[PDB]
Amino acid sequence: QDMDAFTARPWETRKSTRTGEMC
Amino acid sequence: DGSMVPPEWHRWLHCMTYIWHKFNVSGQQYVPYSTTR
Amino acid sequence: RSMHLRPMGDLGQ
Amino acid sequence: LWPMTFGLACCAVEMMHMAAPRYDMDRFGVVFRASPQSDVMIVAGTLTNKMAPALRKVYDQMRYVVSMGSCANGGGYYHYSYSVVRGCDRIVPVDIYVPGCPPTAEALLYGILQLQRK
Amino acid sequence: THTGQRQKEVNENFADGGGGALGHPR
Amino acid sequence: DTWYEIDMRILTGYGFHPFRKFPLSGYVELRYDRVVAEPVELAQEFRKFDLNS
Amino acid sequence: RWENPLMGWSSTADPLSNLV
Amino acid sequence: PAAHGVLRLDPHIGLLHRGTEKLIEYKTYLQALPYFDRLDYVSMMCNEQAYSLAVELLPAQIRVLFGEITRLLNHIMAVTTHALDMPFFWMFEEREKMFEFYERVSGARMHAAYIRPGGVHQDLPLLISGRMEIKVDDAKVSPPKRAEMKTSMESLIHHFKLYTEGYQVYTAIEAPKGEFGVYLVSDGSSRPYRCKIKAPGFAHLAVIIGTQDIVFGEVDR
Amino acid sequence: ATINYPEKGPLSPRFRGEHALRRYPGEERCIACKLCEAVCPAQAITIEAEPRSRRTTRYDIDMTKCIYCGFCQEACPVDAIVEGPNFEFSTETHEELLYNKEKLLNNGDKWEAEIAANIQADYLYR
Amino acid sequence: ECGF
Ligand code: SF4
Ligand code: SF4
Ligand code: SF4
Ligand SMILES: [Zn+2]
């Protein structure tokens, strides 16, 4: 891709952890 | 009220041209909740 | 935080 | 239901469209009104922290509140900003919530008629 | 709910792709 | 055409520099509950995205 | 970061949470 | 009612300030396009045309035709609201017809988010200072068509990255209210580093009040 | 002009109203790519997924942050999320405007006889 | 006074 499980995705994760918790 | 029109007739009336009604049941009413464990 | 009794708490509350 | 208009941003020009010939709120008895001799206040448009005291003051001198638009509802596009009140519920008690950004003049007409039913 | 989780709104129908460009990536 | 601003007073509330690279949501909310200011607490926090390839 | 009672969001109280 | 929205008489503006310019810095170039319809909410397409022109740092263009339709929409509002300070109804019927044109081309009567950097979102349906194909054939800037996105791997990759991350990246126009310009500072990332919005009404505001057609969504941004 | 509301004003197949989650001709179409959430210019979409296939456990849309711009419908690579034709879903409380996966799926199950003909009318311009 |  880098440019003519199913738990989280790379962009939203801080860093891993998302929202305080990482065919 | 306008929400009484079935979706099939909603297209025709607005000149746009598992299924699945129920009108606006606010004031069923939908109450939100977490859909996760 | 996260008719006159409505602006008192958050959503739900 | 003589409404006093708090026209803040774009929701305001979608509600002056409902008094336009096509929708004509006056035919329902809902008149483009004046000094808060008004029954329902339509918070249409982003409420800023700077303006929230004014909104509460005009609420106090007035009754029902209809919240038009995502901004007035829960902040909308500007919810995460330091200058905007995340919703007008935090300032005034709201009776009807008209979603959309902006909601269509027909949607606000629906909100007004549902307030009439209330 | 189908996930398993203040009426409690619960959908009842517990769950290229057909249609050509109306489906999913082939 | 960074008046012109830049205040970033011409744009901020009375007694409030936001456009400094200052948290997005700020430091204080406003509620009735007058109208009073309180430390900012978001029901949902802004989810910082790491988009740079 | 606690969980919102109504929708289960990730609430916060630190303004500088997303300051990078 | 003749406060033109929110005005404390200088003019103590700040009643419609929402930190738009700061929020644009936290959102990619596509996510920031809707922010430009909500500035002069009587000149939505003209507002989002200047942003598109600036971004195209980096076309459809239909953009000039809809900019002229938007000029008519804005001038109707300006003249009729000036008179009201209601012909307002007489010409707001025509404004409603134009809103129907907007909705037929984009899907929303006011905030279309239609004129995008690279051209316009979709084709016309088989359609009508300063008070009434259709997009660049570069799938690294403009998203590919949905049919190609579901049949071609490069198109799917580009559709994925242009909507999650975006594309890696003053300009003034004659908006119906004056010179609407944007000073855009990119950076080199997928999000703008800085976005200053020169609004025609800011300098003009520095009972008109009606003849300067002041919209507070742009004086405050 | 005056029309007799609630005869209703003209709209187009591209109208951007109430959102709905859709299904294949029973299985849901959302495979939880999170591209609608990533694009959502108002951060109105909170998604959580788990194996389970790859389907969402949480799929929420905050109609009070949403600017109703259709970007999610456009970002979705499977036609699962969409703006429905419904513009008459006004509520009496704020909480009813914070949708859920169940609310959105019920919206997609109620408005499907119309959000499937509108797409067929407009899918060739997309 | 129109708000204050
Ligand atoms: S809800 Fe949308 S249309 Fe209404 S004031 Fe906010 S940005 Fe403008
Ligand atoms: S609705 Fe579509 S874009 Fe959003 S997570 Fe599901 S499949 Fe992905
Ligand atoms: S229409 Fe736009 S603002 Fe609303 S949920 Fe979809 S992407 Fe987000
Ligand atoms: Zn398949």
Residue numbers in the entry:
A (entry chain 1G): 117 to 118, 121, 126, 214 to 224, 241 to 246, 248, 704
B (entry chain 1q): 78 to 94, 108 to 110, 113 to 119, 122 to 131
C (entry chain 1P): 13 to 14, 57 to 67
D (entry chain 1B): 164 to 199, 201 to 226, 230 to 285
E (entry chain 1R): 12 to 16, 27, 32 to 40, 60 to 70
F (entry chain 1C): 77, 79, 129 to 130, 133 to 134, 136 to 137, 150 to 157, 160 to 164, 166 to 177, ...
G (entry chain 1Q): 64 to 83
H (entry chain 1D): 56 to 64, 77 to 123, 125 to 126, 130, 134 to 135, 137 to 160, 164, 166 to 205, ...
Which statements did the authors publish about this structure?
A key group of these are the respiratory chain supercomplexes (SCs); these which primarily consist of complexes I, III2 and IV (CI, CIII2 and CIV) in varying stoichiometries, which serve as the minimal functional units for NADH:O2 oxidoreduction. Our in situ structures also capture numerous reactive intermediates within these respiratory supercomplexes, shedding light on the dynamic processes of the ubiquinone/ubiquinol exchange mechanism in complex I and the Q-cycle in complex III.
CI orchestrates electron transfer from NADH to ubiquinone and concurrently translocates protons across the inner mitochondrial membrane. Our cross-classification results indicate that the type-A SC is the most abundant form, determined at resolutions of 1.8–2.4 Å in most CI and CIII2 regions and at approximately 2.75 Å in CIV. The high-quality maps, as demonstrated by discernible ‘holes’ in the side chains of aromatic residues, the precise positions of pyrrole rings and the Fe atom in haem, and S/Fe atoms in SF4, enabled us to build accurate atomic models of this form.
